[PDB]
From a paper:
HPFlong is a dual domain protein that forms a dimer in solution. We report a novel mechanism of ribosome dimerization via a long-HPF-type two-domain protein.
We furthermore obtained a density-map of the L. lactis 70S ribosome as part of the dimeric complex at 5.6 Å resolution, and were able to confidently align two copies of the ribosome to reconstruct the 100S structure thus significantly improving the density at the interface. Using the recently published structure of the 70S ribosome of the Gram-positive bacterium Bacillus subtilis (PDB-code 3J9W21) as a starting model, as well as the highest resolution E. coli 70S structure (PDB-code 4YBB22), we were able to model the structure of the L. lactis 70S ribosome. Along with the rRNA, we successfully assigned most of the ribosomal proteins except uL1, L7/ L12, bL9, uL10, and uL11. Additionally, we assigned protein bS21 in our map, which is absent in the model of B. subtilis ribosome. After localization of all known ribosomal protein subunits, two regions of undescribed density remained, which we assign to HPFlong. One density is located at the interface between the 30 and 50S subunits, and the other at the interface between both 30S subunits. The C-terminal domain is located at the center of the 30S–30S interface. The C-terminal domain of HPFlong is thus a dimer stabilized by hydrophobic patches and intermolecular β-sheet formation.
Author numbering:
A (entry chain B6): 1 to 44
B (entry chain BW): 4 to 91
C (entry chain BD): 2 to 273
Write the structure that this text describes.
RNA sequence: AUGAGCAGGGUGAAGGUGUGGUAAGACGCACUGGAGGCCCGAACCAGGACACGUUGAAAAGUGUUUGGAUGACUUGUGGA
RNA sequence: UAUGAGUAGCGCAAGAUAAGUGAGAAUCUUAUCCACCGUAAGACUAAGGUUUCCAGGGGAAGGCUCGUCCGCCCUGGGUUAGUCGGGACCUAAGGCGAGGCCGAAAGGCGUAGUCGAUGGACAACUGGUUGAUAUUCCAGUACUAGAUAUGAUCGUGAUGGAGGGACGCAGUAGGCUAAGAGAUGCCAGUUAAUGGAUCCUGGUCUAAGCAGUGAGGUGUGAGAUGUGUCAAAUGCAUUUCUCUCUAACAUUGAGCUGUGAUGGGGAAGCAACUACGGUUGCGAACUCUCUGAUGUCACACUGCCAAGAAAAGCUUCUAGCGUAAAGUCAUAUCUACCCGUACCGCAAACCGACACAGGUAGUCGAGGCGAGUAGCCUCAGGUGAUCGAGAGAACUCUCGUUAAGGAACUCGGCAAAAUAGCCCCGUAACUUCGGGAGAAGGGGUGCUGGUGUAAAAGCCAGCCGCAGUGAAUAGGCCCAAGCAACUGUUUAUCAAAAACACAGCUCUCUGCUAAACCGCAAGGUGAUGUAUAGGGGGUGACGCCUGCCCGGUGCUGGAAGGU
């Protein structure tokens, strides 16, 4: 039937935008894990 | 000041010539009033206005990896009459 | 004041009708601005925090004169309107200065009675005297222990209140159910009577019209899990012998009282 | 929270009205009149049964029936 | 790398021939017929997709087969705005939150404030136009806002103060109109095979302005005390009256009437030449009748209770106002930003790993019957949905039949069957008096002329019929019992019920900075609530009834003593 993601643009951001991830002193930490690994991109 | 990039030559470009219009390019960090008066300065051609449109970047493959070809703001130079067209 | 619905269909079986039958016409006043609010029980935290709840409308509340700290004016009642919120009805009032003040209505008032206090006024219905001015054995409401501070106390939708007595600093007043507080004697007071009385007996058939009332329904604790409730679920609708059943929280409920006698109180009491 | 709707068609209350009804009401029959977890039935939303398939079109269906069908509806939007 | 195995499948629907194309055609292209959908399988538009669009070229893979074709690949173009959607406006729900609050810390809360549209504010609409963009390009008309150019004159009049915007649902009536039917009228063909003429396009105008109107609401005003509008106010509502409630007047208003605007639109066709494919140019009337909406006025009205956003744009008031061209209108000509604009979008681009048999806003949505957006066949429109040929095995599954008999089959009439439409008769039982109930059961139903039906059935006779809602589409009924009242809800990936819930009824707890609850606290809910309310427990309408036992437990209360 219905599946999980049928997102819109607000949906694809607003959990994972750079200030959203940056905001709570925590997601920016795991982003810095994502930087200290340094994969294909950062914010998505 | 002369921060016009280049003209654009399509088959619609000759329709612009007959219409006293053009298809010119500038940098992205721009405003149609600003490049309007810049065109007025370096050209002395009498402009009605410019249309809005830009072009998205074209990310196809060009070579053995992805050709990330960039967009550019296609400036539709709408003139008025009684001025100097440029046939280049 | 209770009409009925004719039992046309099932679900419409009893349907104890309203008999609003009394209220001035419609259209409450527009500068009666109070912004609407639904916590839906859930808090700053906001998980549920508060039980079965929810489903009303954009209930556009309005400033009643909770305090009525005003003075000796032609305080003209104009209309008695419907309340979505509270059981008694309500009434508009203009003073001399041309304002749109507004009070809880009573049993038998009428537009143009203009009833007011200084506490100049006598014992007729609708005066905000204090009980230092009011004599013994009367039928009041709007008495609150903080003077200069309106209704938090037993100004009561439902029935109004009564007063047994007073001495010195305070006032020997019953509320209901054989209860007496002794309240600060020069705190304000509105002699009279509640607006509506029979709005304790209206039986209404549809669960969904109680959802139009706006409470999502209440589960029994019985068939709920041992994960859920101390009603230990198992075979059948089995009985509960587990020592005086209780909340899904962790205290026994029937019986015990939970006074908090260690209060800013208890020198303002009755026997019960 | 803001919005979107939810074809049609019956049903017929209450209410109101008027005369025979009445000292006066209760009554009589009209007239409105539709309220209604009303009904039938579309979209719509479900899934009761049955057949098919079940390494399947398919990580949960099809097809035929079935229910609700102005609500505790359905559901967009954007949130907690 | 086998194997199974050249087997399953080849992903829900029909094409057909001729001709081209090429090297090679079933599957590419055209022609010509057929066919299908058509309250869609059309068009347009959200989210989404992120260039998939088109042009040209090619066919390594991809296309479930072929393949010259392509959403495949290379190359190149393609999206245009003062008015369209957003932002440069406001703001809900909410989020962030300097201040502050508490907290090992991080933090979490939160006043001011700040963003946050799905909302509320506001100017442009007709015609043409490509391979593709069109409300965007341009012809015509605007209007909005500003500018500088220019006779004002004391004027502007605020964050204040008001007003206003500004709102629930149902239902009826019109009003007009889209939209459709019929003829007038225009254009082209009297068809070829009995007959012998009637055949199908015809059928315009945009908003803004200018002026009114379907009409609607709406009561108006005047004076005085202002008592106030945190200051002031002439603005506001009410103290008190002169009235006078014609509704004049303040206040909105579909459409229409002209104008706008004689705007090119418009076919058979005609020429011309451009392959003569096509393009250019030229060319007709532009009538009325009838239906007429759920669109429209407009939540306008009526009515009923679950009693029904927000601020801001806007008006008025003055505090101020060099008020001296700030203002201000004429006047003149320019300007009017940034982003988005292509295509698809019930879908081969979305989300279902896939060219998938799902899901997916919303708005329109033809006629003919037909209440009907259900059917059914054809509009407009779009489509042939992707491996085929043979042969008609058995078997498997979807379909149609069937004597005679019926449920004897089976645990079980399970499935199928059969009935149903519309009208008109008629309708038991109990009932909580509504219902039951479409009970049941019955009848009719086609056509021809009358006459009456057009507003309108019934009549008469006839013609027929196997069959007359000729097919489609659309109840099997009854008796009885148990459970549950009922509607709702219920395990999506099994189970819809007696399960839950529900009004109801019962008890108990809570007098308020509630109880209770959440959080370390702070803060907040409870609820701008006040014992008819809130919380917990039971039971689940209505009717009857709820008996006994305080030994024990728990609870409550009491204090003598023990501890």
């Amino acid at each position: 039937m219905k599946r999980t993601y049928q997102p819109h643009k607000k949906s694809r951001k607003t959990t994972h935008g750079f200030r959203s991830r940056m905001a709570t002193k925590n997601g920016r930490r795991v982003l810095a894990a994502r930087r200290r690994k340094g994969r294909a991109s950062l914010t998505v | 000041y002369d921060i016009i990039r280049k003209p654009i030559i399509t088959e619609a470009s000759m329709a612009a010539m007959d219409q006293k219009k053009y298809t010119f390019e500038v940098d992205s960090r721009a405003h149609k009033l600003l490049i309007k008066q810049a065109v007025e300065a370096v050209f002395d051609v009498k402009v009605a206005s410019v249309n809005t449109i830009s072009v998205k970047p074209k990310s196809k493959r060009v070579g053995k990896y992805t050709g990330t070809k960039s967009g550019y703001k296609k400036a539709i130079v709408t003139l008025t009459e009684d001025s100097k067209t440029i046939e280049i | 004041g209770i009409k009925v619905y004719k039992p046309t269909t099932n679900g419409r079986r009893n349907m104890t009708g309203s008999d609003f039958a009394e209220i001035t016409t419609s259209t409450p006043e527009k500068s009666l601005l109070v912004s609407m609010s639904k916590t839906a029980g859930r808090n700053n935290t906001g998980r549920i925090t508060v039980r079965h709840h929810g489903g009303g409308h954009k209930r556009k509340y309005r400033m009643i004169d909770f305090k009525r700290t005003t003075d000796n004016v032609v305080a003209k009642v104009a209309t008695i309107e419907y309340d979505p919120n509270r059981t008694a009805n309500i009434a508009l009032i203009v003073y001399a200065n041309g304002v749109k003040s507004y009070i809880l209505a009573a049993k038998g008032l009428e537009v143009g009675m203009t009833v007011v206090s200084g506490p100049d006024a006598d014992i007729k219905v609708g005066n905000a005297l204090p009980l230092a001015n009011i004599p013994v054995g009367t039928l009041i409401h709007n008495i609150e222990l903080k003077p200069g501070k309106g209704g938090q106390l037993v100004r009561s939708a439902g029935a109004s209140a009564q007063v047994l007595g007073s001495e010195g600093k305070y006032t020997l007043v019953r509320l209901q159910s054989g209860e007496v507080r002794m309240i600060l004697s020069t705190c304000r007071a509105t002699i009279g009577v509640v607006g509506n009385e029979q709005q304790s007996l209206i039986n209404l058939g549809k669960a969904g019209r109680t959802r139009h009332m706006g409470i999502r329904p209440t589960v029994r604790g019985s068939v709920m899990n041992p994960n859920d409730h101390p009603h230990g679920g198992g075979e059948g609708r089995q009985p509960v012998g587990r020592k005086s059943p209780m909340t899904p929280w962790g205290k026994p409920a029937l019986g015990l009282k939970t006074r908090n006698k260690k209060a800013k109180s208890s020198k303002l009491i009755v026997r019960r």
